[PDB]
Amino acid sequence: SLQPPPQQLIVQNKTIDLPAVYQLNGGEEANPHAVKVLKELLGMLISIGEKGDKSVRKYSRQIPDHKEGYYLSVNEKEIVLAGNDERGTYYALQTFAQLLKDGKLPEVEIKDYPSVRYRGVVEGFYGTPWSHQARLSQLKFYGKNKMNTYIYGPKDDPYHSAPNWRLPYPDKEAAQLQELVAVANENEVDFVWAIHPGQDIKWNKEDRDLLLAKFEKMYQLGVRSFAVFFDDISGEGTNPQKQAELLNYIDEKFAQVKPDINQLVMCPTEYNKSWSNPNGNYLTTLGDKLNPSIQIMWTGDRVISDITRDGISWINERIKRPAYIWWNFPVSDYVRDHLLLGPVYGNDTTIAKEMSGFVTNPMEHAESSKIAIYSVASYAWNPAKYDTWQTWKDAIRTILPSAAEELECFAMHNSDLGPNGHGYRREESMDIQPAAERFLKAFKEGKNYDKADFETLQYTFERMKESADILLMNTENKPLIVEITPWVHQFKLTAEMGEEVLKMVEGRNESYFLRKYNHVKALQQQMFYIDQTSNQNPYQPGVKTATRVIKPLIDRTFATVVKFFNQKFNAHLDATTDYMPHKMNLPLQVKANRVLISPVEIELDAIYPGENIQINFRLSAGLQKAPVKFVRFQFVLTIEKK
Ligand SMILES: CC1=N[C@@H]2[C@@H](O)[C@H](O)[C@@H](CO)O[C@@H]2S1
Numbered sequence: 001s002l003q004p005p006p007q008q009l010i011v012q013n014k015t016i017d018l019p020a021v022y023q024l025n026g027g028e029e030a031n032p033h034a035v036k037v038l039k040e041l042l043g044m045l046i047s048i049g050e051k052g053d054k055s056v057r058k059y060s061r062q063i064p065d066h067k068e069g070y071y072l073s074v075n076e077k078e079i080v081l082a083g084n085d086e087r088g089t090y091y092a093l094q095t096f097a098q099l100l101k102d103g104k105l106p107e108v109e110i111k112d113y114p115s116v117r118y119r120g121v122v123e124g125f126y127g128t129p130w131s132h133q134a135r136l137s138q139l140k141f142y143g144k145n146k147m148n149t150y151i152y153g154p155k156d157d158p159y160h161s162a163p164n165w166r167l168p169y170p171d172k173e174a175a176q177l178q179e180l181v182a183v184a185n186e187n188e189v190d191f192v193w194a195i196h197p198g199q200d201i202k203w204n205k206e207d208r209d210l211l212l213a214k215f216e217k218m219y220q221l222g223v224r225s226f227a228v229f230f231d232d233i234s235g236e237g238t239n240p241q242k243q244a245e246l247l248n249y250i251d252e253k254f255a256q257v258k259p260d261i262n263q264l265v266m267c268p269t270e271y272n273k274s275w276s277n278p279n280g281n282y283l284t285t286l287g288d289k290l291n292p293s294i295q296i297m298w299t300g301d302r303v304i305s306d307i308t309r310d311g312i313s314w315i316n317e318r319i320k321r322p323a324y325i326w327w328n329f330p331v332s333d334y335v336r337d338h339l340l341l342g343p344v345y346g347n348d349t350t351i352a353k354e355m356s357g358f359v360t361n362p363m364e365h366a367e368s369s370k371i372a373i374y375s376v377a378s379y380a381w382n383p384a385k386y387d388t389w390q391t392w393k394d395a396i397r398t399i400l401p402s403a404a405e406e407l408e409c410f411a412m413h414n415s416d417l418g419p420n421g422h423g424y425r426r427e428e429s430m431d432i433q434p435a436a437e438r439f440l441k442a443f444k445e446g447k448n449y450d451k452a453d454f455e456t457l458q459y460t461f462e463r464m465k466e467s468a469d470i471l472l473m474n475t476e477n478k479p480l481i482v483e484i485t486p487w488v489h490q491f492k493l494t495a496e497m498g499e500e501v502l503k504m505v506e507g508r509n510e511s512y513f514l515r516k517y518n519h520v521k522a523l524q525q526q527m528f529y530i531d532q533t534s535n536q537n538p539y540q541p542g543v544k545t546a547t548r549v550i551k552p553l554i555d556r557t558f559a560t561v562v563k564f565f566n567q568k569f570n571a572h573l574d575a576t577t578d579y580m581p582h583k584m585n586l587p588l589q590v591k592a593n594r595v596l597i598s599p600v601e602i603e604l605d606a607i608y609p610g611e612n613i614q615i616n617f618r619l620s621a622g623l624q625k626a627p628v629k630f631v632r633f634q635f636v637l638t639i640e641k642k
């Protein structure tokens with residue numbers, strides 16, 4: 001499965017062998033980055049070059065007349081790799097590398113080019129910025145998948161955002177950035193350095209010069225594309241006239257003055273329809289006043305959304321140019337306890353002409369995001385032929401060949417975001433969703449359930465456990481495994497709980513049932529400890545997994561079978577589904593050093609120093625470290641733990 005799929009492919013159902021002896025025509029005059037790839041890969045004539053080179057004159061009418069276009073031919077007599085331009089030749093080679101299987105090439109002719117001009121990744125999330133090593137890995141991944149754009153803009157980099165956007169990077173970070181630009185250039189990626197000055201920018205000469213001064217420093221490190229972001233700010237930095245004037249100044253005094261600057265992009269304050277005032281002048285001001293070479297970014301009809309024909313028509317009409325899409329998936333920075341490892345879908349596949357670019361905002365988990373990134377690369381290059389599920393499967397097998405089926409199992413049940421303030425959800429566990437939904441309907445109402453449905457759930461829990469143990473021990477992609485490990489532990493526990501809960505449904509005798517029930521309570525407690533010890537970030541601490549379909553099913557099944565046990569044996573077993581050490585009909589929650597009522601008396605499991613209490617029917621009272629176990633009366637106690 002060539003990824004991205006070429007615009008045009010004719011296959012001959014013959015194969016040849018990579019020539020053991022070959023003649024290379026055009027090596028000294030073709031893109032040096034393309035020649036190095038070809039030489040790594042390896043008489044029969046092999047012709048490599050860009051349109052205009054002597055080496056490729058015979059094929060000049062086969063070469064697509066598109067930026068980043070190429071002609072690739074393999075037959076009995078010869079191999080041709082001909083770009084419309086240097087980047088096209090590199091890309092011919094990336095397709096060539098995928099065709100070569102076990103010293104053998106199929107007989108093929110390809111004519112190819114991208115449908116969207118700018119394709120790639122914006123590292124533009126809140127959270128821990130990617131590591132240097134992660135970024136190096138990403139850049140190489142982008143070259144293989146024909147992504148030409150990497151926008152550097154981590155919200156939490158103090159040299160990118162306020163107030164230290166004014167300061168040059170220190171030497172060590174500066175040397176790192178320089179290395180990234182070198183590696184980007186080698187993989188035919190535009191490194192686009194972004195700045196986020198809007199929260200404390202003064203519209204004066206001092207701050208304008210400081211911004212230009214910073215861009216000059218980045219230029220000296222080798223940066224040749226630049227962005228200015230005005231997202232998620234308030235105050236005087238939201239002024240569109242001043243924003244347009246600053247960007248026009250950067251364009252006129254810097255972008256159009258240097259010998260070799262490429263992209264100049266801006267992200268607006270009104271960056272989606274819901275955040276834009278239909279009766280305000282903001283977007284029209286930018287559209288009218290911004291120099292026509294400046295790109296304007298857009299996230300769709302909401303902060304988190306997929307791109308539709310109508311939504312993009314709306315923005316394009318106002319900004320008077322095709323929108324440069326900032327797509328907010330798989331970014332998880334607002335559901336930080338979830339991994340979003342499902343397929344890329346929901347974006348209109350017929351609107352390439354209406355966009356100047358398409359970039360993905362990924363997770364803080366660099367390797368994990370490669371599933372979506374590979375898929376966005378495929379989509380943006382050939383939207384017409386974009387295949388959601390095949391691409392997801394191809395991504396997984398690329399990322400983890402040694403355990404592709406195991407990663408598919410884990411990813412397929414780690415796709416949804418759960419409820420959230422952005423209203424954005426994805427499908428999860430759809431394969432088993434109907435079996436789950438039947439089983440539980442039947443079971444809850446005392447009608448007999450189908451054996452096949454019970455077996456399906458059983459098979460699922462078994463395969464999850466296998467997948468988890470195998471993924472833990474995988475050494476093919478260590479950085480991926482480090483990223484997901486906490487979720488994998490939680491995924492195994494979920495599967496073990498499901499297995500035990502189903503043995504309870506098969507309920508042999510009272511004694512066996514009680515063993516199973518006690519095993520389940522222990523598993524709940526183990527899940528709570530992971531949720532409190534792993535991924536303890538300030539915003540959505542912990543680890544959630546298989547949340548849309550599997551966890552609800554296991555929970556409701558458990559509560560149901562305990563209710564029936566209590567009726568049959570006149571018993572009083574606790575049917576609660578999440579473990580909670582503190583006692584309070586709403587469920588308590590524990591988040592860091594807070595104990596919380598999910599929106600009279602609370603008894604903690606020990607005496608703690610009390611920090612404060614926040615109630616809300618903004619009530620507040622510090623407890624000055626006063627010992628506290630009981631608390632009688634949002635509703636949030638904070639304690640020293642801490
Ligand atoms: C433009 C946008 N700027 C923000 C990004 O930095 C976040 O990562 C994203 C998800 O929370 O939300 C908005 S979209």
Ligand SMILES: [Ca+2]
Pocket residue numbers: 029030031049050053
């Ligand atoms: Ca050339």
